[PDB]
């Protein structure tokens, strides 16, 4: 509706017998391939990302947001549990870090 890309701003400028808009937009620039998974098996549970996707760089699994590559360690705070591993097609195996365990140990 207002410029190609994700709209941020617009600025009106007058003109003879009309108006001119200066649409400001966000456009992604540099892509990168990753291997992605819909959910993760952990202790028989299926973890889904709260906001982001499960990507991997070949060895480890991280969770990012969709519009910018910001990898984060998969924990129980950025993921939620639903069901078991026998339903989701394409589920993978990975560990999910629990922040309470180090505090319990210490």
């Amino acid at each position: 509706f207002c410029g190609k890309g994700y709209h941020l701003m617009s600025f009106p400028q007058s003109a003879p017998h009309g108006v001119v808009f200066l649409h400001v937009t966000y456009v992604p620039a540099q892509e990168k391939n990753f291997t992605t998974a819909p959910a993760i098996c952990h202790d028989g549970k299926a973890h889904f990302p709260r906001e982001g996707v499960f990507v991997s760089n070949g060895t480890h699994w991280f969770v990012t947001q969709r519009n910018f590559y910001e990898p984060q360690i998969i924990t129980t705070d950025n993921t939620f549990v639903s069901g078991n591993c026998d339903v989701v097609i394409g589920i993978v195996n990975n560990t999910v870090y629990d922040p309470l365990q180090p505090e319990l140990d210490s």
């Binding site: 992604p28 892509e31 992605t36 819909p38 889904f48 996707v53 069901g83």
Partner: protein, 99 residues
């Protein structure tokens, strides 16, 4: 032996100009749009096309309409069957009713 209405119009001076874009070109545009939508979602409308599995794209759609994505990841086969049946019903409605 049978004079045509188009022949009469042509002889009387009313001409129909051809369109610039052919039907093959229009079909190429629609095929490109379909392939981009299927293989990238909305990302091809805001820059460069980003590949993504179609199950993940439908999970994005479900989160967009306010439904948790585990619904799709647990009813994927049922949803695919419903979509295929709806497409078949569209075909049957088009092949029978012309109005």
């Amino acid at each position: 032996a049978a004079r045509d209405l188009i022949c009469a119009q042509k002889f009387n001076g009313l001409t129909v100009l051809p369109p610039l874009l052919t039907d093959e070109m229009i079909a190429q545009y629609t095929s490109a749009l379909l392939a981009g939508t299927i293989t990238s979602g909305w990302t091809f409308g805001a820059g460069a096309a980003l590949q993504i599995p179609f199950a993940m794209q439908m999970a994005y759609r479900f989160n967009g309409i306010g439904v948790t994505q585990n619904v799709l990841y647990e009813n994927q086969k049922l949803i695919a069957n419903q979509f295929n049946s709806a497409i078949g019903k569209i075909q049957d409605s088009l092949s029978s009713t012309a109005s």
